[PDB]
Design a protein around this ligand. Structure first.
Ligand SMILES: OC[C@H]1O[C@@H](O)[C@H](O)[C@@H](O)[C@@H]1O
Ligand SMILES: OC[C@H]1O[C@@H](O)[C@H](O)[C@@H](O)[C@@H]1O
Lengths: 822, 822
């Protein structure tokens, strides 16, 4: 069934009940300030780093889930309820939650009083703004008192959750009931010492009362749903001293029949130069100048609407680079709105903070952020360019690099492991995608240091040679690249052999020696190594280029000679040179990663989709038969049923979940693309629909998570929970699926010198038009698609047929019309 | 204002209401398995290590506090309530929680049904047993269904709370409704991989139903107080697959008026040898042999009662070594029961897990465990001996040592800092105390490695020499010991100068250079260096001893020459060589640590308590005047009002809390002892009463925490929360206060060759008798105390007068009657 519906004209998902299978959230902000907001006002906000600068507290695995956030307690004649339903759970006459692009609206109505709240992070602002509209829907005048509520976090989320022996005595706040634009509360924990920042929580009106101490506001023995203050109907004007600081204002409202009133609340992040931190000589009063300015910028509903309009224009402009109009509205919906929206989120968040990733140990992964670029370069190329520079700056002189870096400092760390041999090549993938998109070859000349070291700068292209050379010089006995800690699959640890519980397979020291090789890195090298070669040729390096393509040829040969099992590609060779992912073994006979990536690299591709002799065709057929399910393709089959000490973390998961038999959505688009390469568009489009949000909305009670964004994994067959997803939002499957549908299914993909139009989506989408802005020109691509198996397009440009499927880039400001016949 | 009372005869603290100022807990277990149990059944259990082997989940800073633990939902004709009050909070006709030694009883009654639960960890068992007795107190037959409940933790507490991206898919259980002694549930997360252990939760009867999935038991949108299963009146027989495993059984009972029924539940920790892990050849079913045996040892109420009586005898024996009988029942209560009970707990827990310390970052402290030995050696000398060995094994060859070690592996780590220069000398303190107590000189010969390195073994005594030499070879320009990271005071970081927010002062690396010196370590060195000299002389090391005594004299000379501010002792010299803790500064004029420790070391002691010219008297007079409050002695005065970059973490706390103006109870006993040294017993006893539990019970509403145990800190005079405590249970305050009252106030203390009897407690305790078992002999010490200042005792033994106050140890098996006159 469903718990809501898409509203395409408004670019929102409408949740019609608070009783969803799981908390469904939205991300506010797209610059440096972010907020996680559930359809029940749950979540938290942070500035740049969810671990080091978290403004508000949020409890993971709470009972019940998501029982804390931005609340507005309404007391109407003694009756207390919250429009977000939770935490009070009063019966509401009406309830609706709309998640839009960069903003959300939550509305609850009870006994003649409707309360709607608009949540969003304004462009250029480090704050979350709430515009509350309370309306009297009865035929008689009403009065009520509204109590706002937000629980602060002590900035360092990790410290906040574990170091009470210290932090229960450091909570500090300041109260300003009579500010220039209304009342405001200041959370200044540790501002006394090393912090040059504080948070503010204010409203555009002089509040009747306030509260900053949670225990006083909530009351002993009470949950947020039984908060004492709202029930009493009067603030306690508590001034916190240690323990748990909060922000709360009481506002008395009076409304004639049909009359409404707006209230604007602001949660802001402020900083002061060290030499202007205090308002007094005694250094006891925080300088509120920046806070006042901010509150002044959102003192009226007109300012809020103006900012919301700018955010709308912002998104209209971002989404104008790639769009499609076809016969499939679920497809259009994904392509024009949601997939691109999610790509903005993953670009900004990586895999750090969601309702699954706790925003503590994970920052910006090297592999993750490079891949996120693939689906983000068309949105804001300049930010992609800077990201590439930041990512490459955490690379080592020998080619390898830190697996991730801390958001706040942009410095690498080993917190979640090191020495993953697939990491280096991803840098080449991200740069190539960026050059193809923007044509900014100058980026290759950008000076980039190694591990942020002063004096170690070399041109970015040199960094790429280091990455390319790292693989060529780290191949094993079969000519395949050594896997190291692991490859794309973090759970394939062939140099681990751990028997000690508790220690993460991710950071437990690997064993020296062995000949563990990866077939995945082999295909990855064949694919991106070829791009490296092209980048070198363009720079005039015939020497470097020529050698590079030789190595690519050697590894390609190695894959066919030593990485072929008979009906599908081998996965790897373990520490002892034993094959992994072979039909000879009882479990884990076939692994999906190499099948998709090898064919993407053109390995084993025959003369056509019906060439049942080509290994690429055999591999894909095997994938379909052994890994296919109604919810997507599982990682490997059969799943491991006992701990395989030589394979690492993989077999530690019960069958059907995560890397052991689960549908790891991220690698499904690789098979999708592989199928388009071989010329089987119908099957590729089929796989796309099995895991895409819009197509799975009708089974929301099974998927359970958000119906408008991709998740990391869906329980595979073999799991009692088959079809149920976990880890929504933060996943590379967003970037890879946008790549798949926009560039290979719909077929519009940027190349170095032109735009290739190579549709391969099958018969289910007979006609569509893609509007693509590229290199400053607008391309109107009109496709008439027969869907014929293996049939590829022929183009006519501006009234004249052309050869091939690559349209040379037209000059900026131009508008070219290409007619496509497939 | 009280919420209960002491029951001396039963050795319990009786809590008469569930509405306490804060959750009040008891610790179950004294060997390898421990349980934190609040008066509302809240808390959790773990095996040896709270971070690595935590059986059950507990949420710190939950709303409301302590909502989660061992619950028993009672469904009486549709009405659902819990005897522990929380989480349902149904009105109870009667409620009472009794915390005893190693066990607790919680009783709740509602509408004709009384439910009593006995909680405890049996000796020699790694489990928590619950004996539940249900009684029909009405005049008509009753039928009710009891639902047990406990939420499992995924072993690694840190992973459990932060790695959901993985662990929401690994939870695994096994259900055994028809076991040999009743029904049982097995929590076996990760047993399929590296863990050789699992937990069991069973009941001594065949249950009507069960539940292993939290969400199914509790229900969507519900808190534990609104659990659906109990409300429905029957188990859902849920079998978990990932998410949140729980243990729950349902038992229907029918009781005639006045009839009662017993049910015995068991939460156990089981291990299996690798070759005995599975019941099947396919390795899918856990071998339950050890679990079946455990459940068999507690299948009857008779077995429970026998184990409880064994526990009672165990404590009677432990408390028979030192006890007193005076005219003060609060004093007696503390000395005979509670202070000693707490010392066993600190010995076992160090500072790792309480309702404040989270059982994650902290293991067994080097400084902490050495000091706890001071109040534990008389209880179980054999276990203190091993602890000394384990501690010394984490020491480095140069004398320095790991600041703490992981409880499960006994290996040190730098998780909470490194290079604390006071650490080394504490090892000598612990060993000296142990030898004086047991006369086990052989321990100095025990082979002991450095940093657990096999083959690096060296006599324990040699480790002491390393500690001694470390201080000798690390003195500054004034001849005082270099402070390093920090001394006893973790917040006096003079080599820090941090301006980077969020990074712990404890772990942030420090700056080389400077001349920062510590007066505290100087005093510490004089005190324990003297002990080292004695041990060296007794070992036959005449020259080493002579040398040692020489170094000791130099350090004490430096204290009086470079560590005296005029009216009190200086605290230290900063990185720049400037004095810390001087009247020349506006804040932090006088610090308490050096005042108490220097005098304890005898530095500055004059002709008597009336000698106003003796520095020791001036110092203590300054302490009384500037640091004294009705709740104890504050750490320093005035507290710092702005961040002092050269002092480290200390000034980061708001005035009046923790190390910045708070009453850090741990250092109060040093001033208490100092006072008995200068001959002012009345003042010393006064200070003892200010911070002692039994004396603060009458103001439970202000202390707020447990009224039967010491806390780490009580808010100081500069705090708005003055008088309010934080961090109860785990503190060196327990061991040090026991040392103070048992050895210096009451005056009975062990020496190398005899038992010292030197009372110095003032006129408030005119007569008392101490029964002390030492070196296998019993000493009945009858004291007639005038309490006159400066007055020291004269003794008579078995009818004859003796010289001085030291009674040479009598042969084992004898009873010595000492008559003391003061
Ligand atoms: O790491 C433990 C230390 O942490 C510091 O922040 C606290 O102020 C000390 O009281 C404590 O001993
Ligand atoms: O640390 C991150 C990694 O943790 C592993 O436990 C998971 O199986 C991986 O999916 C994840 O990438």
């Amino acid at each position: 069934m469903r718990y809501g519906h898409f509203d395409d004209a408004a670019r929102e998902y409408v949740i019609t009940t608070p009783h969803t299978p799981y908390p469904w959230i939205n991300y506010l902000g797209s610059e440096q300030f972010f907020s996680l907001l559930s359809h029940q006002a749950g979540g938290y906000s942070f500035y740049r780093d969810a671990k080091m600068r978290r403004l508000t507290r949020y409890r993971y695995n709470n009972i019940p889930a998501d029982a804390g956030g931005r609340y507005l307690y309404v007391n109407d004649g003694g009756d207390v309820w919250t429009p977000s339903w939770l935490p009070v759970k009063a019966d509401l006459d009406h309830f609706e939650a709309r998640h839009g692009l960069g903003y959300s609206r939550i509305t609850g109505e009870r006994n003649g009083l409707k309360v709607e709240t608009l949540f969003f992070v304004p462009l250029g602002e480090n704050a979350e703004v709430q515009k509350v509209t309370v309306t009297n829907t009865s035929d008689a005048p009403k009065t009520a008192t509204l109590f706002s509520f937000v629980e602060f976090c002590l900035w360092n989320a990790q410290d906040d959750q574990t170091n009470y022996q210290r932090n229960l005595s450091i909570g500090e706040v300041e109260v300003e009931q009579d500010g220039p634009h209304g009342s405001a509360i200041y959370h200044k924990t540790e501002y006394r010492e090393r912090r040059d920042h504080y948070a503010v929580f204010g409203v555009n009106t002089r509040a009747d009362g306030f509260d900053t101490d949670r225990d006083t506001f909530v009351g002993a023995y009470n949950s947020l749903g039984e908060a004492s203050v709202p029930r009493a109907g009067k603030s306690a004007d508590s001034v916190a001293s240690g323990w748990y600081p909060i922000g709360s204002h009481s506002v008395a409202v009076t409304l004639q029949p049909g009359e409404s009133r707006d209230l604007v609340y602001v949660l802001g992040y402020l900083e002061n130069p060290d030499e202007e931190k205090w308002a007094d000589d005694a250094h006891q009063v925080v300088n509120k100048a920046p806070a006042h300015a901010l509150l002044g910028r959102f003192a009226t509903s007109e300012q809020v609407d103006a900012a919301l309009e700018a955010l709308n224009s912002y998104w209209t402009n971002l989404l104008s680079t790639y769009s499609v109009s076809s016969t499939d509205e679920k497809l259009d919906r994904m392509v024009n709105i949601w997939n691109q929206y999610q790509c903005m989120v993953t670009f900004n968040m990586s895999r750090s903070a969601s309702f699954f990733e706790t925003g503590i140990g994970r920052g910006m992964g090297f592999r993750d952020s490079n891949q996120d670029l693939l689906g983000f370069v068309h949105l804001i190329p300049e930010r992609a360019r800077e990201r590439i520079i930041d990512i490459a700056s955490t690379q080592f002189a020998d080619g390898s690099a830190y697996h991730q870096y801390q958001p706040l400092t942009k410095r690498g760390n080993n917190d979640i492991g090191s020495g993953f041999n697939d990491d280096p090549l991803w840098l080449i993938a991200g740069v190539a995608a960026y050059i193809k998109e923007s044509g900014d070859w100058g980026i290759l000349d950008e000076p980039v240091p190694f591990d942020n070291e002063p004096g170690s700068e070399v041109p970015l292209f040199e960094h790429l040679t280091r990455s390319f050379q790292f693989t060529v010089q780290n191949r094993g006995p079969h000519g395949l690249p050594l896997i190291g800690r692991a490859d794309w699959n973090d759970c394939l640890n062939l140099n681990c052999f751990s028997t000690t519980p508790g220690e993460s397979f991710q950071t437990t020291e690997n064993q020296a020696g062995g000949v563990a090789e990866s077939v995945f890195i082999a295909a990855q090298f064949v694919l991106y190594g070829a791009e490296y070669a092209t980048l070198a040729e363009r720079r005039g390096l015939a020497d470097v280029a020529t050698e590079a393509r030789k190595y690519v040829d050697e590894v390609r040969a190695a894959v066919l000679e030593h990485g072929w099992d008979g009906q599908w590609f081998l996965r790897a060779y373990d520490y002892y040179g034993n094959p992994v992912g072979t039909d000879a073994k009882p479990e884990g006979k076939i692994w999906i990663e190499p099948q998709g990536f090898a064919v993407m690299a053109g390995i084993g591709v025959g003369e056509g989709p019906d060439d049942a002799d080509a290994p690429a065709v055999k591999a894909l057929d095997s994938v379909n038969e052994m890994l296919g399910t109604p919810h997507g393709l599982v990682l490997q089959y059969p799943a491991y049923t006992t701990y395989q000490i030589e394979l690492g973390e993989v077999s530690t998961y019960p069958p059907g979940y995560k890397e052991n038999g689960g549908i790891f959505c991220h690698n499904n688009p690789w098979v999708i693309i592989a199928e388009t390469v071989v010329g089987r568009g119908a099957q590729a489009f089929d796989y796309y629909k099995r895991i895409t949000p819009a197509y799975r909305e009708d089974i929301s009670d099974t998927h359970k998570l958000e119906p408008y964004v991709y998740a990391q994994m869906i329980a595979g067959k073999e799991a009692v929970r088959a079809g149920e997803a976990k880890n929504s939002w933060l996943t590379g499957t967003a970037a890879w699926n946008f790549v798949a549908v926009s560039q290979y299914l719909l077929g519009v993909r940027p190349d170095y010198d032109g735009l290739v139009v190579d549709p391969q989506i099958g018969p289910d989408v007979p006609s569509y038009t893609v509007t693509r802005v590229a290199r400053g020109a607008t391309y109107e691509i009109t496709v008439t698609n027969s869907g014929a198996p293996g049939a590829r397009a022929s183009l006519t440009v501006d009234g004249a047929p052309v050869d091939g499927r690559t349209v040379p880039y037209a000059p900026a400001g131009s508008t070219v019309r290409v007619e496509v016949t497939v």
